[PDB]
């Protein structure tokens, strides 16, 4: 279950 | 910044002259992931060389297994030559049937 990132760097 | 490839060359199965086998060139510990690998028979490129998909280890360095079918003989010598940005010139590692 691939993660989904939040705020961008 | 650059990280220099570590290279081993070796057969999948114990080498026996005359008997078909698989030749591996395992390249690790490199950055950036762009890399040129050739396998050589008598200093000439073997044209049919397969490449694993690229991956990277927990230390963030990349790695890749190159491999081609070959048949060892008493006299022929096989080699792996890796071209990459951390090195001014290609690096060649020769196959040693005993290593």
């Amino acid at each position: 279950k691939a993660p989904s990132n939040f705020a961008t760097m | 910044i650059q990280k220099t490839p570590q290279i081993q060359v070796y057969s999948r199965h114990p080498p026996e002259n005359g008997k078909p086998n698989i030749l591996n060139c395992y390249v690790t510990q490199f950055h950036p992931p762009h890399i040129e690998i050739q396998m050589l028979k008598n200093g000439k490129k073997i044209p049919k060389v397969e490449m694993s998909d690229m991956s990277f280890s927990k230390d963030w360095s990349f790695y890749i297994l190159a491999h081609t079918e070959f048949t060892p003989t008493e006299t022929d010598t096989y080699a792996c030559r890796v071209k990459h940005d951390s090195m001014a010139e290609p690096k060649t590692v020769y196959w040693d049937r005993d290593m």
Partner: protein, 263 residues
């Protein structure tokens, strides 16, 4: 026995290129099980173990969309990092990510992981508490403050305590081994003779070889290309006296350590 899931994600920007090339590789118990590569003609997550072909087309469709989200996130993040380190146009850059979860033999969560590298080097990482961030670089403080302000950790922590564990349980049930090393010693004459202890056909890759009643050249463990691994350890020995030296293989699939020699 304990278990684990990881996603290793890579994004590379090159001058000539336009959009980053993005690759994501999923692993269960350190073996590759899915993969996405934006360079593919029809980019999508593809199964990489037969036991994942059990998953239906809605699973693959959602996963593929998450990956396209990551693609957007790594491209923007790459753009921002270019500004953070005052790097100009014309260079190649890399952003990498590792995430996932470690479970105990009881199947409970041992530890969450979330780390990022820029140019092959640690950029920012979620601490084991899944609440605070470690970021060494001065440039990386900008990201740390951004993420502290937006509350990102809570959301990665929810993923890592929930989905990662939940879906790892499902994959373990669906994909329900180890291969013991086979050893042998080889004799090679020199100046003295060389004895090289081989272990072959073992999985997973963790192994140790020694020579002996006290504790040498070796090679790093290497893949055979079939799914199994190889390793050898060798030593310089005087002639005729080679029955006195003993190799010991240690592997997690062995009932007890091997003890053998040249014959």
């Amino acid at each position: 026995g304990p278990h684990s899931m990881r996603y290793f994600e890579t994004a590379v920007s090159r001058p000539g290129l336009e959009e980053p090339r993005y690759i994501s590789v999923g692993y269960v118990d350190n073996k590759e099980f899915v993969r996405f590569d934006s360079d593919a003609e029809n980019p999508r997550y593809e199964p990489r173990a037969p036991w994942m072909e059990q998953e239906g087309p809605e699973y693959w469709e959602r996963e593929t969309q998450k990956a396209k989200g990551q693609e957007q996130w790594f491209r923007v993040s790459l753009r921002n990092l270019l500004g953070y380190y005052n790097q100009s146009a014309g260079g190649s850059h890399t952003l990498q990510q590792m995430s996932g979860c470690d479970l105990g033999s009881d199947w409970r969560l041992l530890r969450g992981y979330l780390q990022f590298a820029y140019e092959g080097r640690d950029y920012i990482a979620l601490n084991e508490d899944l609440k605070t961030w470690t970021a060494a670089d001065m440039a990386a403080q900008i990201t740390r403050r951004k993420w502290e302000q937006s509350g990102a950790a809570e959301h990665y922590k929810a993923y890592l305590e929930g989905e990662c564990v939940e879906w790892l349980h499902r994959y373990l049930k669906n994909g329900n081994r180890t291969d013991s090393p086979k050893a042998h010693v080889t004799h090679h004459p020199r100046s003295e003779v060389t004895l090289r202890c081989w272990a072959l056909g073992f999985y997973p890759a963790d192994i140790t070889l020694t020579w002996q009643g006290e504790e040498m050249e070796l090679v790093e463990t290497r893949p055979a290309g079939d799914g199994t691994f190889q390793k050898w350890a060798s030593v310089v020995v005087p002639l005729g006296k080679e029955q006195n030296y003993t190799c010991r293989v240690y592997h997690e699939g062995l009932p007890e350590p091997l003890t053998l020699r040249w014959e």
